[PDB]
Amino acid sequence: HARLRALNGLLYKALTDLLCTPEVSQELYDLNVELSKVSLTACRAYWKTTAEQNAHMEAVLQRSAAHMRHLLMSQLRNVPPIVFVQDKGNAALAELDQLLAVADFGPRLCGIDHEALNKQIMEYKRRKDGRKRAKPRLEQDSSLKSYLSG
Amino acid sequence: KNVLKIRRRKMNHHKYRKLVKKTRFLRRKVQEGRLRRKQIKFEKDLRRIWLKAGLKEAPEGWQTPKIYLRG
Amino acid sequence: LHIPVMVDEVVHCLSPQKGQIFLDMTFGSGGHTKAILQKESDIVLYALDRDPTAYALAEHLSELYPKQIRAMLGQFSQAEALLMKAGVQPGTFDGVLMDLGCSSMQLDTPERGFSLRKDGPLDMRMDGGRYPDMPTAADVVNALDQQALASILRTYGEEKHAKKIASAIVQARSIYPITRTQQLASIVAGAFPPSAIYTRKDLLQRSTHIATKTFQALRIFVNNELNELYTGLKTAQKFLRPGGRLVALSFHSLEDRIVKRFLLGISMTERFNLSVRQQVMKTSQLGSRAPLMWELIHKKVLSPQDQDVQDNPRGRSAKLRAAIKL
RNA sequence: GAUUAACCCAAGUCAAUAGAAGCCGGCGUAAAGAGUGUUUUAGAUCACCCCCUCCCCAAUAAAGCUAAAACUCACCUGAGUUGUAAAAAACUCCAGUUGACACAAAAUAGACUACGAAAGUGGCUUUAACAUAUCUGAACACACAAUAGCUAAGACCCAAACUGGGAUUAGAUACCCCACUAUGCUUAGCCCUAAACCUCAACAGUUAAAUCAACAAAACUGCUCGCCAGAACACUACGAGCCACAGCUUAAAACUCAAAGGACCUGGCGGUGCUUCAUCCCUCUAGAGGAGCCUGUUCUGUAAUCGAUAAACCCCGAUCAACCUCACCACCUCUUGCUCAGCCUAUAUACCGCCAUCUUCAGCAAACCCUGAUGAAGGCUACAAAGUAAGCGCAAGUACCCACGUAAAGACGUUAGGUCAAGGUGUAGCCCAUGAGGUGGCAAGAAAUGGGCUACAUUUUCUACCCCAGAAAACUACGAUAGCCCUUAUGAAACUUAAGGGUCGAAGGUGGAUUUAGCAGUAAACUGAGAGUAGAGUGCUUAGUUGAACAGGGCCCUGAAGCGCGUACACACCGCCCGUCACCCUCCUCAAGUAUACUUUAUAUAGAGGAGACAAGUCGUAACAUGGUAAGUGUACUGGAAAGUGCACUUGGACG
Ligand SMILES: Nc1ncnc2c1ncn2[C@@H]1O[C@H](CSCC[C@H](N)C(=O)O)[C@@H](O)[C@H]1O
Ligand SMILES: [K+]
Ligand SMILES: [Mg+2]
Ligand SMILES: [Mg+2]
Ligand SMILES: [Mg+2]
Ligand SMILES: [Mg+2]
Ligand SMILES: [Mg+2]
Ligand SMILES: [Mg+2]
C-alpha cells in the first residue's frame, strides 16, 4: 500500500519531468500541461483543465501517449499504459452544459406522529368505554476433587 | 501512556486554587497573625539570650529589627 | 396574584393606540389585556383562548366593555376560521400578543391537574371539556408504548432519562391506571432513588420536583402546543397588518426556538444550539434562505428583572420577542 | 445457623494484641536521575603507559546598521473598504497606484544539525568572547534559568488575555468578526516556574557471554553523587527560607483502601482512515398502501379453548371446526374406569423427536507441528517465507430435460427461537377428579390490522369462435364469489357448508408517504389437476399455455469484506471516568469564653474549614476513539462555578 503510494509518486514525478523537458516533444513542451494526480492500479493521469485549447491539449496528449510510454520504458521500465483524464472540475457539469446548449427546449414538524398517537388514545378510550455477578476468575472447579476422589 | 496521574494532579491543583481564591482574605489575616507571632517569638528568643548572658537589658544601641514584615 | 410577566414591556412594544386592532391569542387571565385597555380605551381587542373559564373571563371583560373587547373560545388552529367569520378576514391586525405556558387560574385549580403540588385527575388539558373526546394526560400515559412515551418525554420534555422514566411509568400503569397527578408524581419519584426527588434545580437554582419536566411534556403533548403554536404564528402572520407589532413570550426552550426560527425564517428542521464551528463545518460539507419578512423590535430577547423573579418565580424563564411584520 | 461426619492440636485449644526476621534492591514508561554549571570537606582509579579535536557554522554581551512587509503622511484616481459559513458591526481622509517612512519582527539559505552548562540561540558589521592537561562533587553555598507575571520609565507597526460591540445560540459564555488594554519590545530591578523531555545522571570501559520481563532507545560493567521504599490524603497542612503576600522551595500525619500502577495481548467500540463490494440507492415490470369481499390476527362481547405472535406470527399448527373433530363452557352422570388406570395439568428456561434464522454463508472441530527465550498469543506470501495428513460442510456426485438451471443439500455456531396440544419423556401436581361419558352451546362487530380474490373497463364487456366477427360502451355502462329469496348436493341434522337460479347493480373511477416480488420460459396473465372431507377454502400443492421490460449508474444512507490506526471500555460506548450537589459517621486543621502565663503571647476546649466514607443518584459531558473543539505542562486574566482564552513548551496526537 505504502509501496504503491511511493510508486504513484514516482510515476507522477517522472511524468512531470517528461512534460517539463522540451526533448520529449515541442508540442508537449509548448502546451505546458500540469498534472493534478497520478494513480496506478494501468495508470490514470489527471491534468488540470483550462474549451478549444482544452480540446487541443487533450488531442495532443492522446497523440503523444504512446511516445510518452515508450520514453517511460527507458527509465520503472515496466510501466503500464498511461490514461490521461481531463479534469474539467466536475466533468459532468461541462458535458451537461454542452448538451444543454445542443439540446432543444422548443417554444418558450413536531417530530412525532401525533395523529397515530391520537388514534391510539381514542382506541384506548373506546376500549375502556441489579443483582450480584460473580467474577469469572473466582468460579469453583470440582474436577480436581473428582480426580482425587477416584 | 495515559495521563491519569497527571489528570489527578491537575484536578487537585484546580481545587486548591479554587479554595485559595474562596478564602484568600482569611488566609491573609492568618498569615499576618503568624508573622506577628514569628516576630514576637524571635524577640523573646533574643531576650532570653541576653538575659541568660546576665545583661540586665539589651546591649546599648541594639533594637531588634522587624525581619518578618514586608515594609 | 401572578402579575403578567413584563407586561410593561409588552405594552411598550405593542404601543396600543385608539382605533387599532389587537389580537391576544392567549387571553387567559387577561392581565396583559387589562393593561392594554388601561393604555387605550378605544382599542378594538380580541381575546382568544381555549379555556372555557378564560372565555368566561373574556365575557366578563365584555360586560365591562361591550364591544371594545371581543371574546373568542377556540384553539389556534380554529382561530383562522373563527376570525375569518368574526369580521377580520382581510387581517390587517395592528398588533398581536402571544403568551405561552399555563394560566394562573389553570395552574391553581387542582381539578385541571396542571400541578403536581395539588392532587387531581391526570388531565393536563387546557380545554375545560369543550371537546370531551380530546385526550387527557391519563389516557396518554396509560395508552402510549414504551418507545412512544420515551420519545414524547425526550423531545417535548427535554428529559435525559426518557428510556428509564417511560419504562417506570409503563410498569406502574400495568398494575393500576394512572389517574391521579400525585400518583404520577410518586411513580416518577420511584423511577429514581428518593434522594433524587428534589436534586434537579430550576434555572433559579431552586429545588423543584423531579417529575416537573415530565409533567410539562405531557401538557404539551396533550395540547399539541408546538404544532398549534406554529399554526397560530402562521395565522397571525397571514392576518397581521404590514408594519404591525407582534410580541411573544416564551417560557421554555422549545417554544422560544419555534418563535425565533419563525421570526428569522430559519428552517425548523435545522439542528438546535448551533455553534459557529458547527455552521462552518456544515457549510464546508455543503460547499462541495427565504427572503426576510420581519423587522425585530428587539434583536436580543428581554428577560424579567431579579425583583420580578422574586415576585413571580414562575415567570423567570420567560423570554420576550418583539417584531414587526415586513 | 443447626445437625451428621471429618480434620488439626490436646489438658488444652486459639480469638485479640505484641514481638520474632530486614533494603549489597532499584530510578526511560511502574515510587525514584531532581532545569543547568562550578567548587568545598572529601571520594574514586577512569590521573602515569594512554593518543585526536584551534579548523566551518544559529553561544553570549555591547554599539551601529536595514532588505522585505506594516503603520503613518502626501499626490492622483476611485466610491466604497474591511469582514464571514452567511452576515452584521466597524471604517468611509476609506481603498488602489507612486513616494517618503521603525526602539517591531528577522523569508529563501536550513533537505544544514552547528554554538552554549542548561534555558536557549537562524538579518548584517565590528569589538570583547566560548572555564579546567584526572574524574565525581550541593532543593539550601556561588552563578544562571523559556514562557507567563510583578515594579518603574519609555516605545507601540503588528499580535493580543481582559473589556465593549456584532453575529451564532432557547439563552449566557465560548468557538466567528471588529475595535481596544494589560502583555509580547527597550532600560533597571524582581519573580525562579514547565511535558525545563534525548521523560536516557556524570566519568571510564566493553561488544564477549545469558542479547533481553514488555515497550521505549542494543545489552552491560566499573566508579561517584542525587533520589525512591503500596495507593490516596499531598505540586497539601504545619515549620523554615525567599524582594516572593491568591507565591515558590523543602514537605508530613491522622482517618480510609487491598489494591494503586507499568508494558502488552485478545475482544468490543471509534461523530475511525483507506480500498472494494451488495440488490443498500437509482434504473425495469407487476403489485400492496384507496374500494368490496374471502381469510387470519388483535380488541370488544360471551358461560365459552390452546399454541404461534420483529425479521424467523398473522389462509400459522389446519393437507381445513355445523354434530364429531374438541382439547372450551353450562348442566347431568361414572369411579379399578379401553389400558397391570388415567390427565390436552405446570415446566420448550429439563429434553428427545421435527424445524425456523443467519444460510441468497464456507467455514468448523478434533489430532499434530512450528514461532514468540516454551508470556497472553501467533502460524500468510504460488517465481511461496510453517503449517498439516484425516473428519464434517461447501464442492463433487445424484434427481428433473444437458455439462446449464431448478431442486435437494447446507457443517459448527447464533436467537434458553418454536413445539410438554404429534408422540415419547425428566421433574412437579391431580386420583369422588386437573380423570371418564352424555346432551346442549359459542363462532357477534362499534372496530383496527395482515394476506388474498374481484375490480375500478376500451389492450374493455357480451356472444360466436378459440384469435380476419357482430354488438355493448356511464345512470338500463363497467363493477359482488356481498345481501335477500328459492332450489339442489352432502348429511341423521344446512338461514349455518357448497353449488345453481332469481333478485339487487352497491362501494369504487388506478389509490400518500411507504412497501412486496422478480433477472427468462422468469415476472405478468390464463387454464387444469391433486392432497384433504360425508360435504366444505378466494387456501395449499402441482402440471401446462401465452410471455415480456431493465439489465446500467453509485457509496450519501444501509450492510458486508479486507488492510490499517486508536482504545483509561471488558456488564465491553445505553461503556467508563471526571467535576457538581443543604444531611448523618471517622480524621485533621482551627478562631471563641474562661483557668495558668507576660500586657500580648504562651497555655488547657470550641465556631468554622479540609480529607474520607455514606442514600446515592441528580447535573455538566471535561477525559478515554482525531472522545465529537488533539491532549497536556507552566503562568496570567475573566467566571459564583461547569470552564474559556493569551504566551511559550511537550508528543505522552494525526497528516498531502
Ligand atoms: N392553542 C391554543 N389556543 C387557544 N388558547 C391557548 C392555546 N394554547 C394555550 N392557550 C391558552 O393560553 C393561555 C396561556 S397562559 C395565559 C396567560 C395570560 N395571557 C395572562 O393573563 O397571564 C391559557 O389560557 C391557555 O389555555
Ligand atoms: K527555514
Ligand atoms: Mg483530589
Ligand atoms: Mg565537578
Ligand atoms: Mg526567568
Ligand atoms: Mg499595547
Ligand atoms: Mg525545551
Ligand atoms: Mg551529577
Q: Let me know: does A19 contact A38? Beta carbons within 8 Å.
A: no
CA–C1' nearest nucleotide, residue B25: D246
* C 244-273 → A contacts, CB under 8 A: 268
Exposed, middle or buried: residue A125 (CB in 10 Å: 0-12, 13-18, 19+)? middle
Mutate to test the pocket of ligand 1, among C26, C29, C60, C77 (most ligand atoms within 8 A of CB): C26
Around ion ligand 3, which residues have CB less than 5 A away?
B 12
**Strand bridging mode C44-49 / C21-24:** parallel
The separation between the first and the last C-alpha atoms of chain C, rounded to the nearest angstrom, is 37
CA distance C165 to C274: 28
Instruction: Collect all residues with Cβ–Cβ distance below 8 Å to C157 and sequence separation of at least 6.
Output: C213, C214, C216, C217, C218, C220
**Cα torsion at C213, C214, C217, C223 (round to 10°)?**
-120
Which nucleotide lies closest to B5 by the C1' atom and the CA atom?
Answer: D261
Residue of minimum CA distance from atom 3 in ligand 1: C75
Indicate the helix (H) or strand (E) that contains A2: helix A2-20
Amino acid present at C137: A
Count of CA atoms in the C-beta half-sphere (13 A) of C287: 6
Q: What are phi and psi of C34, to 5 degrees?
A: -65, -45
Those residues whose C-beta lies under 8 Å from the C-beta of residue C63, and which sit 6 or more positions away, are none
Cell numbers found for residue C169: 411509568
Spell out the residues 6+ positions from residue C267 whose beta carbon is closer than 8 angstroms to its own: C261, C289
Instruction: Give whole-number Cα distances, C90 to C82, C84, C96, C239, C243, in Å.
Output: 13, 8, 15, 7, 15
CA distance C154 to C43: 43
Residues 6+ apart with CB under 8 A from C171: none
- Verify whether the Cβ–Cβ distance C135 to A111 is below 8 Å: no
| C302 phi/psi in degrees, rounded to 5 | -110, 125
CB distance C172 to C187 below 8 Å: yes
Chain A nearest-CA distance from C59, in A, is 32
Nearest Cα to Cα of residue C304 among C77, C60, C1, C3: C3
User: Quick one: resolution in A?
Assistant: 3.0
What is the C-alpha to C-alpha distance for residues B30 and A147, in angstroms, rounded to an integer?
Answer: 74
Q: Is the CB of C160 under 7 A from strand D?
A: yes
List of residues 6+ apart from A127 with CB closer than 8 A: none
Burial of C274 (0-12, 13-18, 19+ CB in 10 A): exposed
Q: Which of A117, A127, A128 to mutate to test the interface with C (most CBs of C within 10 A)?
A: A117
Q: CA dist C128 to A119, C49, C112, C203, Å?
A: 21, 11, 8, 30
Query: Nearest-CA residue of chain A relative to C156?
Result: A110
Residues 73-102 of A with CB under 8 A from C: none
| Interface contact C143-A110, CB threshold 8 A | no
Euclidean distance between CA atoms A135 and A147, whole angstroms:
25
The single-letter DSSP state of residue B60 is T
Residues 6+ apart with CB under 8 A from C95: C14, C15, C16, C20, C21, C22, C23, C244, C245, C246, C247
Closest to C41 measured CA to CA, from C22, C27, C25, C13: C22
Radius of gyration of chain B measured on its C-alpha atoms: 22
| CA C72 centroid distance within chain | 18
- The alpha-helical segments, DSSP class H, found in B2-55 are 4-22, 24-52
Residues linked to residue C48 through DSSP beta bridges, in sequence order: C72
Close Cβ partners of C83 (under 8 Å, ≥ 6 residues apart) = C23, C46, C48, C72, C89, C235, C239
> What is the 8-class DSSP label of residue A34?
-
**C210 exposure class (CB count in 10 Å sphere: 0-12, 13-18, 19+):** buried
Q: Strand D: which residues 41-70 of B lie within 7 A (CB)?
A: 41, 67-68, 70
Indicate the SS3 state at residue A3: helix
Residues contributing to the annotated binding site of C:
30-32, 49, 76, 99, 106
Interchain contact, A120 vs C144, CB within 8 Å: yes
Number of the ligand 1 atom closest to the C-alpha atom of C78:
3
CB C162 within 8 A of CB C150: yes
C151: Cβ contacts below 8 Å, ≥ 6 apart: A112, C162
Q: Is B5 exposed, middle or buried (0-12, 13-18, 19+ CB in 10 A)?
A: exposed
Total count of domains within chain B: 1
Residue keyed to cell 515541442 = A26
Q: How was this structure determined?
A: cryo-EM
Q: Is A134 helix (H, G, I), strand (E, B) or coil?
A: coil
Q: Given an 8 Å threshold on Cβ–Cβ distance, is A125 in contact with C140?
A: no
| Nearest-CB residue to C227 (from A110, A122, A123) | A110
Please state, in angstroms and as integers, the Cα–Cα distance from residue C322 to each residue in A41, A123, C176, following that order. Answer: 63, 42, 47
Q: Out of C9, C29, C36, C49, give the residue to mutate to test ligand 1, the one with the largest number of ligand atoms within 8 Å of its CB.
A: C49
Q: Which amino acid is at C158?
A: E
What number of other Cβ atoms are within 10 A of residue C115's Cβ?
21
DSSP state of A80: P
Residue C91 Cα to chain centre, angstroms: 23
| Spatial separation of the C-alpha atoms in residues A11 and A21, rounded to whole Å | 16
Q: C-alpha angle with apex B48: B44 to B49, nearest 5 degrees? A: 120
Q: How far is the CA of C80 from the centre of ligand 8 (A)?
A: 90
3-state secondary structure chain C: CCCCCCHHHHHHHHCCCCCCEEEECCCCCCHHHHHHHHHCCCCEEEEEECCHHHHHHHHHHHHHCCCCEEEEECCHHHHHHHHHHHCCCCCCEEEEEECCCCCHHHHHCCCCCCCCCCCCECCCCCCCCCCCCCCCHHHHHHHCCHHHHHHHHHHCCCCCCHHHHHHHHHHHHHHCCCCEHHHHHHHHHHCCCHHHHCCCECCCCCECCCCHHHHHHHHHHHHCHHHHHHHHHHHHHHHEEEEEEEEEEECCHHHHHHHHHHHHCCCCCCCCCCCHHHHHHHHHHHCCCCCCCEEECCCCCECCCHHHHHHCHHHCCCEEEEEEEC
The dihedral through the CA atoms of C214, C215, C216, C220 has a sign that is: positive
* Domain encompassing residue B8: 1-70
C309 Cβ closer than 6 Å to some ligand 1 atom = no
Positive or negative, the CA dihedral C303, C309, C315, C316 is positive
Extract the C-alpha cell encoding A95: 458535458
* Contact between chains at A117 and C224 (C-beta distance less than 8 A): no
Q: How far apart are CA C23 and CA C70, in angstroms?
A: 9
CB-CB contact of C236 with C25 (8 Å): yes
* CA dist., res. C209 & res. B70, Å (int): 55
Residue C249, φ and ψ in degrees, nearest 5: -120, 130
Nearest to C143 among A110, A114, A121 (CB): A121
Strand D closer than 7 A to residue B19 Cβ: yes
- What residue type is assigned to position A48 of the chain? K
- Measure the CA–CA gap between A82 and C309, rounded to whole angstroms: 76
Edge to edge, the sheet with strand A35-40 lists A35-40, A43-48, A82-87
Instruction: For chain A, say whether C148 makes contact (Cβ under 8 Å).
Output: yes
Q: Which residues contact C23 (CB under 8 A, 6 or more apart)?
A: C45, C46, C48, C83, C88, C93, C95, C96, C97, C236, C239
Distance CA A23, CA C182 (A): 93
Is C125 near ligand 1, meaning CB less than 6 Å away? no
**3-class state of residue A39 by DSSP:** strand
